[PDB]
């Protein structure tokens, strides 16, 4: 509640830890940034189809298809769904190291200190200078979508979120959403000809839904002395496990009875006739046969692109760990990308060191569901006889080297016994929460965000600069204006609950330290010139038993 | 409560709409028909095996196998589970147009005005005439199965339901159920020989269960003045979504940052280095790569017949939309039936125009889970390099044209990220509700009925004519009788709740109108001669956002 | 209640639907726009006569007479009486599709965020630049006319209403009213000479009434922090029927007794001696003779221009449907405009696609009162004898081809038995309400607006910019000023009640859909370049029985 020269709101980027008697803590992490808003290019909405030329015009690249249809709005999106907005590299270490599981509690946010200004270039065409002046009666438009009537676009994907540096100002993107279209692109190989390609794209204007912010939801017109607050929100969603499960399918159970070695250089051995009980098939009991409570993880066709009614698209399995340094004894033959891995491309605003673009490919440390793909093999019989993959009188199976398509590349072993893990949070760039799709069958996991809202997610927040007109305006498709921009302050608070992990074991545990695992430590702190980069860190570190 | 000349019950086929303050309505739709019952052929039960000759005796047709074992009862089934029993073409339009979701509430039914009669042919063998007389002390037998001890046979499949014309009388079928058998039929191609076929069918009389209506459940003997009522029933089941989701996997999310076109004939373009954040694999961010909340729909082996311990049978995926008119730019190569489609064969009683048989193949308008099958392709690496399908030093994947069996015909991409939709109600012929199978793992959807009873479904209802004997009866396997038939009135009431869809968008929505979409409008209304046909209409029409 | 940097009021363009237990709903549709006001040209009032030259100076065109007298005020009119201000194309569809009748409830409106500014051109005459600055102590003048002392000018005619685009700013016109004059223009044909024309126009300054806003009604002087509100208003007027009556005079009643056809290609026939009862005149009973409850619609002289004491003017009958595509079998001979039709000319502000002007001629779908004019004929006797139109011993009548003037062009059949319908609402351009003329005999309908206020209508609203003076002012007829303009926000809320139509019939009804009836669907949604047009739609669509 202030005027021209009275400020609203304050800057709090701190974090807090409130411990409780029952062995849990509450983490209050609040964040505040200065945002730079700029006027839209056109007053109205646009439905514009787009495509990538090199994908449709060359035979082999159908995986490059960008062809779609979207609608631009004269509105900008204020989104903080990434981790790196809320908490620092030290906060991440501290949560992962002592944490067992965490859950979301509440979210609230507001804007204040709006301060619009105008820019006017003057002088001769040789020396042109712009002057800046507060326009005190100018208005900025702001609204939040509650009841979630608009399409839901998370901005953590595509890296549009508020910036990660607490001491720098930030930019917002312009909001947009898809509009219905039809697409078909034929499959072609490095053989044949480009005149054989058929691409079909048509925007469907009868079926599509066209939303406008103005008629959907109410808007607050706010001048310099005004502020806007959402009022508070309460999450309802699943808890997230912070421990890494080292166990695989093969490590679940009671291990067999063995004879211990007498010498330090020696191996244990399993005596024949010490092999007893349950297994799958007809064979002696071996570590491969043993009946176990469930299978961990599953095979999935990779990488397999599915052609929807609009465009090709990819069907992933959850991401899993890739063996990194196995001292020679590696999987000899591996592909460019192996276990469902994910990459991110980000820029300076999101924690790159400089104005260039940076790329990072994630390798999770989750060991459980991971499948070395070259070692799969099929056996027509369980009998435990030597495998013969040559075509003839004795053909008892096939191996991933024999028919790679059938075994290595396109198995699907999903079934009733399978159990999988979400790859967990990813810092700074990961998405915190996501709404659930509205369908008869729901998914069992989401591809990125660890949290899934059971009820409606927190509503999306939009801003724009109201038009500022000269004296000659007649209502016409095009008209002169006054160049105007706004800089406002954003503040938000996210509350989470964490339970503390008690010491579970005798030997010393592996935690998240400095100078080796993450990298050179000097690379994450400021420079002589003031430069640093945000460490890209994995969500789960301290091991735990899954069964 | 009436005698010989006092009627019981009344005719109400009307529908009602009761609106509520909270934006929902109650739909009371009740239906009444005159049913013609005829005496059974044999007094007793029969366990009769059957087969189709042309399937076992020719090499290539194993998909024609009709071979099974059933038991005939001297009882008829009164079933109204189809939509077309309850409500008119205008009621269907009105529900779909303004409706958002609907749920079932209650069901009740009764029979009245029983009126049995006898028929006796007399006269010379040249001119033979039959006379008709009320037999006032004759009895009709009626019972309903509550507690659901008998096998559950829905009659909407096989088209045995009460007729769809409000102004015509109806027929009931004779009730029957399966009895255990063993079956094996070997697979043979258009090559080789018919002496190579081996068909095995044996009814198993030790294991099978044999039910008789008389000893399972109590029966009401009712004369002309008598009536019978079930007493009312209350559904517990899932709600059904009435909107069509236009979105696919590829339309879910925030669309990319693009450069808008300057000209009306022009396309948007995605600038390099404007490509940021999350995706699957190692490549630049493209519409195919982008990480999305979930995958919509899944690949499934089609059409794949599985051989159970009795007979072959087919494993479907849910039905989805087939691209119809795409202006040339179609999927070039498509099969006789493509996306899990379903057909129905029906007759005059169920809304055909005349005494012939009619066939209709359903095409749903649900766009979401549909998969154009010819566009699938596999990539051994995510690197985004040109695809090479020729065998040699560089083989980076395969396409649906390269190995159609592996890619097009027999993929299974089901997994943790998948989400699907039920194809929704179908009018007039669709099944309204279904009981759930009693198993450790339940299904996630049912193949036809939109509603799944959590508790026991409404009990099935049976009728028969009691035997009417001449004077010479001694208890013997075969005996003379008096020819007798009954005509009774059936009445039922189904209550449903619907929530009203508020206007969600700016542009004009697509609703269900006349004269174009359905067809010629003159074809659905009576003729000079009194003839009409029931429009076959899809359940969901007004689009909505799934995410 | 705010100052320089404190905003007043908020932006709400949303619509709402509140359903009720009795089967009606309340529609709250509120609208908000940014208005650009500019300073008047002259401080004072003007009484200026005008004329069109080409009408008085050429023989044949007396229908082009523009000659009148008006008075300009230094005031602008803020009017929202058009439909297209309040609600979107989807709202229109939704009301017409499920609505039966609607009535008006209340109206309220206010202005806020006034922000005046000044413009000053500076620099050399080669490069002249204007600068813009807030003048914080400047005042805008605003008043509303309650008690309705001023002449009532609806602005929906002449297309002066606030614009139809929710996301664009708007312009207001300058208010003006008629001042008494005398006019006579002689009738002349394409024959004779222009020296025979006599035009007489004299403004009458003794009789005429001269109103000034300043002395009639009080005015509020408001600066930037000020706002103005009218306080609310309550309609009292007639209800409006939303259904289209398909029936004509000839379809009202019990149809005759006929013999049905045996064949599908065949026609029913009316047996002689099956013709019984009431009719008009002496003849057998035919569909033309039958006594009916009333006559629907009436003949009227068209097009007939009446010369008032000032100028010629036209006497319309209500507009009715024109047969469009009748497959050949059309009315062979039709005029440029046939059944009392109406056109509208509108510009970009009111929903044209671009800066050009657009024209649309309305064809109502109301079938009832429409009269095909070429088929009228007169019979001197009712006897049913063959009509003879040749002059001689047997002349029993005349036909529209025989004497078109007497029969086709100048009949008036209005009388005691006649019944007519208003053509209903028209979107976006139609007028919502109108005040009733103050006379001994009132009209039975109004030409455009569906609603007629019984009490006083809502008062008209006026704005102007107060004069902003330089330092040299002495009171003189002409003086220097400071160039000043204002941009204010307008907000209003209109409440309506609608009753919901229950399903009335068996066959599928015709509703308002997309892609065919209205036109190309892509034409009503934004473009690649952001362009769209407002569909011009008719008020009544779902048929209903008038009797």
Residue numbers in the entry:
A (entry chain G), B (entry chain A), C (entry chain F): 19 to 565
What does the paper say about this structure?
The capsid also protects the genome enroute to the nucleus for uncoating and replication. This study determines the capsid structures of TuV and CuV using cryo-electron microscopy and image reconstruction (cryo-EM) at ~2.9 Å resolution and compares them to the recently determined structure of BuV and other protoparvoviruses toward functional annotation. The VP ORF encodes two overlapping structural proteins, VP1 and VP2, sixty copies of which assemble the T = 1 icosahedral capsid in an approximate 1:10 ratio, respectively. The individual VPs contain an eight-stranded (βB to βI) anti-parallel β-barrel motif, with the βBIDG sheet forming the interior surface of the capsid. The virus capsid plays a central role in the infection by the protoparvoviruses as it mediates the attachment of the virus to specific receptors on target cells.
However, one exception was the diffuse electron density observed for amino acids 533–534 exclusively in the TuV map located near the 2-fold depression where only weak density was present for the main chain at a sigma (σ) threshold of one preventing reliable placement of amino acid side chains. The extended channel in TuV is not the result of amino acid insertions in the loop, but is instead caused by a different structural configuration of the DE loops which runs more radially upright from the capsid surface, compared to MVMp where the apex of the loop is tilted. The intermediate phenotype seen in the TuV capsid is due to this loop being truncated by 6 amino acids compared to MVMp and adopting an alternate conformation. The readouts from these arrays showed approximately the same average signal fluorescent intensity for both viruses with strong signals over background for TuV and weaker signals for CuV (~5-fold over background with large error bars). In the TuV array the 17 top glycan binders all represent SIA containing carbohydrates (14 highest are shown in Figure 6).
